[PDB]
Design a protein around this ligand. Sequence first.
Ligand code: SF4
Ligand code: SF4
Ligand code: SF4
Ligand code: SF4
Ligand code: SF4
Ligand code: SF4
Ligand code: FES
Ligand SMILES: [Ca+2]
Ligand SMILES: [Mg+2]
Ligand SMILES: [Mg+2]
Ligand SMILES: [Mg+2]
Lengths: 754, 196, 154, 127, 144
Amino acid sequence: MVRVKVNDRIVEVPPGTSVMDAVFHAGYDVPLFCSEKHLSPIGACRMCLVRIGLPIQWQPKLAASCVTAVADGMVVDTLSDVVREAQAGMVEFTLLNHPLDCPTCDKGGACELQDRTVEYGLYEKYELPVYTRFEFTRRHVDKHHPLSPFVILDRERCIHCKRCVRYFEEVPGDEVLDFIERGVHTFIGTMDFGLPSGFSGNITDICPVGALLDLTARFRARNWEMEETPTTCALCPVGCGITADTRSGELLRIRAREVPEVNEIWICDAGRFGHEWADQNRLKTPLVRKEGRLVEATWEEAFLALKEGLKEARGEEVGLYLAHDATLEEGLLASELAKALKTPHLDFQGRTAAPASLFPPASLEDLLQADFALVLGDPTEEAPILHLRLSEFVRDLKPPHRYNHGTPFADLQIKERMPRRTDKMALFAPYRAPLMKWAAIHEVHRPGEEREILLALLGDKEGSEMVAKAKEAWEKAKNPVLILGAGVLQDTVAAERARLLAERKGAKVLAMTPAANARGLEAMGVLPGAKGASWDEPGALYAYYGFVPPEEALKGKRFVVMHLSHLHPLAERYAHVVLPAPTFYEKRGHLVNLEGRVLPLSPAPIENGEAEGALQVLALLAEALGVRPPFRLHLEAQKALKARKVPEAMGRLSFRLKELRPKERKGAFYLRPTMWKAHQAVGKAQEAARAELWAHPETARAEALPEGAQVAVETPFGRVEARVVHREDVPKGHLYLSALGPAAGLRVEGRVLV
Amino acid sequence: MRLERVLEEARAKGYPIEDNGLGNLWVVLPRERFKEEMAHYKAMGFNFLADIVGLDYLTYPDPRPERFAVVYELVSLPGWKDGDGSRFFVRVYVPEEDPRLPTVTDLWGSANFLEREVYDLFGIVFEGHPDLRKILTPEDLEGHPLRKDYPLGETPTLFREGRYIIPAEFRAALTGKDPGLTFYKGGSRKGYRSLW
Amino acid sequence: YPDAPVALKPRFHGRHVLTRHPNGLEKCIGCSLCAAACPAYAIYVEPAENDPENPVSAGERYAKVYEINMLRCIFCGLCEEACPTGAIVLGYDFEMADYEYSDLVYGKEDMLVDVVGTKPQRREAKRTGKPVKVGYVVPYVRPELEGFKAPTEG
Amino acid sequence: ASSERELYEAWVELLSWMREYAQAKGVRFEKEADFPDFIYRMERPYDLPTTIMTASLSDGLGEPFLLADVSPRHAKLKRIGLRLPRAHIHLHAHYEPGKGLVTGKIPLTKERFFALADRAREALAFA
Amino acid sequence: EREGILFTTLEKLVAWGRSNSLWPATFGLACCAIEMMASTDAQADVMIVAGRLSKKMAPVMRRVWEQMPDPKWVISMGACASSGGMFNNYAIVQNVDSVVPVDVYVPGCPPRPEALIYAVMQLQKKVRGQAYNERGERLPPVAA
Ligand code: SF4
Ligand code: SF4
Ligand code: SF4
Ligand code: SF4
Ligand code: SF4
Ligand code: SF4
Ligand code: FES
Ligand SMILES: [Ca+2]
Ligand SMILES: [Mg+2]
Ligand SMILES: [Mg+2]
Ligand SMILES: [Mg+2]
């Protein structure tokens, strides 16, 4: 370790440290534009200049601290008149051509420039103070221009900190934004229009100013006027970290909360821009059926009408069915209830053929430290932030040393424009997968056809050249990790062989399950008993539902209770009691990560109407059926988790489970795992969560399916409308349907009506 | 004058002299030596006891000796006997898990009400005060309001259409231990002072 | 002496008025900065995007909702001071007690410059058909209150 | 001089041409920004013929193929400005007494303008 | 005959009566008490609450109110009585209405003497049963 003395304070610090993070670790501080966490540090804005001695021999020019490595016995001056005088000059030069919209700028009080300006600007040289020296025409250009349905660019505001272009190349890897002409005439611009990356929203959080701004939430409130709620996203298994911004019971904005242990400071687009549905159409009063129709009732008229439908009910026809995002608490109760209430009709909306708890959870940090990545499925669609890790991984970037201020602002490790390794990953997905670019060993197969590829990798059959190339690298692999998702976890045959491959070799796994809390709900024993009535198989006769199921699993049943948060058409025609429930943005409880971690879920001040959690509602269904529930409120339910011995927040719960409930898969339609979920198709995310049907140009046109045409598609999961797409990377005869749910990775009988 | 003889003494015996450039100066006595040496001050010629302030440092950015602290202010009125007009503060930190501190009601009469208030609003006991009874807060108030961990208790302000405001979540103002709305704060936002 | 008008000074702190420019646009660009400085948490501002064809104000931003809870307000003018446009400005009306609490949050239409009188005064002059009499006079109307038509024979 | 006044008299006129062309070739005209010296003029006086400082001719996607600005009231070295975005072409029109709106020496007429904007539309326009 | 022209037209008068027979029992606290002694200078029905109502002092105003002739009115003077005012904390009752039914609220801090005049002039049009709310309804002459 190197002995550096910042101002008067001396500090230890590892050799590969920036003079910046040196000075921030010490306590002291400095201006800061272009440089960002997890982005390659450069000296472009030229504000972090400091004075440096390497005796007392002071260097003749000022050094940009963000791109200078600490030498041993170094001295850093950040206070001298020389420094400050410069600092205030760098402020001055920035504001030189800046716009003057502060009051009317969505970049509220949350604006790095504003702030720094008042922190270091307006030097005190020792008569009226001179606010502005520049007195000429400013830089007028393109203003208030939407790049996407989600992003709005203000060219005038841009201060050229290279953050966004820099971010696009490095993190996701989609060069969709870059600078244009040179000199004082340069601006930000695109020729990829759509803003094609599925990680475009993150520029919104990096931009130091208000050029790049989240348009989902233009002109809602000022930054201090938001009621920030630090929680977790439950749209998929990665379980990131967000903060929900509200004001007056409505959902305004989604930003990312920093949580290095999981998603670093990044968030995927469906999670950040798909939130307008929880705002809007909502079930607020419990409905009960009267004249073959539903009408407004009370929890009174409901708790009674509910005793009535369950009075003559046998305690085995009782079916408990949670949603894919049921809190760890909501599941413990559904277990105990279904325990005391002797039944085998207990399932969760996402549950996969093969228990995700089959494979030993690998730390999201282990992926960085691994040697090879064997991947089956599309990490982009199933577990999006994994794409952003594999990016770091592929560059041999390994976990940063932590300083007093946390994650470094200037990691000399991340060099700009790092060359990516094609030899560290293998990819096998039923299409031209996004990341097949960073994997030389890549091949496109047919759906469910992975059960055979897995046999191959073990060593009991021959596979394509690639498959063998892969098997070869996995052998030589010192400490690989195994990433797998849909068809792998949705096919008894394959999944089982998988566990083997990674059981023989001492290697961990990342299971990209179609249920957000799959790994946690399984840990509570929220899987069905030997009977067979599972979340899509109509077996129950009297059952509870915490989501909307396939039409076929409700028919013939005697009593149906739908615990929704919105009124689905299927429910208003087949249900007998509808109870209002909260979105995940407004639930209090815990979750279990795809990597076996446990994350807190906080409740946002949104408009719940007259809704109650499944925590409560379940106990109400417990009375209506005999034995009183062991759980009431959340304060007490927490003791029952502390009794199963599930570690506190941020910890990891080891829990393996050996058993598998298979099922035959009727290959006609493949339900393609996607980032956007289907209930997100509202407002702006209106087209980005529209379904789409893929087919190979021959078979495509061989079954009357034009290029860009809407098309009625019928399925065991319901009747969706979608645009059709020609893709040569798709096997002939098969049709890939955009499965925008936890119904992803399935093979299903279906047709297309005309 | 009479304060010189105070400082020339504290220096000698391990008492820390705290000094802001602005015109006040403290002297922090330990727990025990407080009672007696505080009497020493009255005899020295300190007749007037101007104030007595309670401080809870719980939410203070930099660490301090113990969680609580009380400050006393001593004077020599310049219109009496010989009194020079020496003034200053004397402070003592006080354990959190043991809020007791001997009274000076023996020495100054003003210290009566003043000590009572420091006890109402912070939980600090005074060994031997005529009657440690609540002064300002209503009789049935549970706990001690002026300390950091006791809520201000604010109501959301109300407007039409169910538009409401929560003062807590609204304040653009920062709390010193507060990180700010952007990554970090620095420069004049960590403290500013001009050079007259 | 509700028969002889109260003579108030030009600086007097009355019911807020929201001024317009000559052009007829409102001065307020919905910045919620007034609301920010306010000790009482008495101002609520919802912003909206101007329509270029039919504009409310000169920015790209106007004030969709503007609301002041007078039962919270203290009349400190801290707000008029924070404002970058010269929009919100304390006025002269003081005659403004009323019956239902939530009737004391004024709105944009309640405080524009063109409006003469307070909620009560205008509401009673409604079911009455007798024009509003303001119970005051002033020497002159401030430079700041451009437009505000008030009884100021002086 | 009074040339400052006459400059703005022409700045409105340029705008008029722009709005004409925009409806005549059926393309987007956009107010890009109002003078800050007008939004923040409090009670202060103001007498410029309009309030628009940055104006543009954008296309189908909203990307500008022509830009136009004019120096604020309280600014030094005043000129009006024509810039064709992606093609690095900047222009500086001043105002001569008894001559007109000139670009160094050439009269910037309604004729000459339309040429520039048509040339720019055909070429630069993305959609 | 509760709602018959006989009884009706009767109480119309009685009301119009105790309308001009209003005897104000000011209950001043802080700064507002001083502004009103600038309006009174130039067995009671109708009490005026002027200032910050403390939580310790709250139960006191209750007794004073209760023991009172039965036809009565409460005026809520200034910002601290009308709601918590600018003191949104523990110490202070957020709206005197929290304790006693208010008939008229008067904004200001402290409201000008002549405001408090309009305040009672309004309380008049109210006990006459001649005052309406912004919703266009007719207000009950007394809170109870
Ligand atoms: S980007 Fe920052 S400095 Fe520029 S107008 Fe917006 S808030 Fe102000
Ligand atoms: S648009 Fe934002 S992130 Fe992109 S370079 Fe400009 S200021 Fe930096
Ligand atoms: S990756 Fe998953 S957890 Fe993270 S923001 Fe996107 S959908 Fe949500
Ligand atoms: S006068 Fe004072 S209390 Fe009233 S809105 Fe203005 S700033 Fe707030
Ligand atoms: S400070 Fe002025 S311009 Fe800003 S919102 Fe308030 S009144 Fe409108
Ligand atoms: S409303 Fe104002 S004048 Fe009246 S008591 Fe409260 S602070 Fe004093
Ligand atoms: S030069 Fe921009 S932060 Fe170092
Ligand atoms: Ca545009
Ligand atoms: Mg626009
Ligand atoms: Mg919304
Ligand atoms: Mg106590």
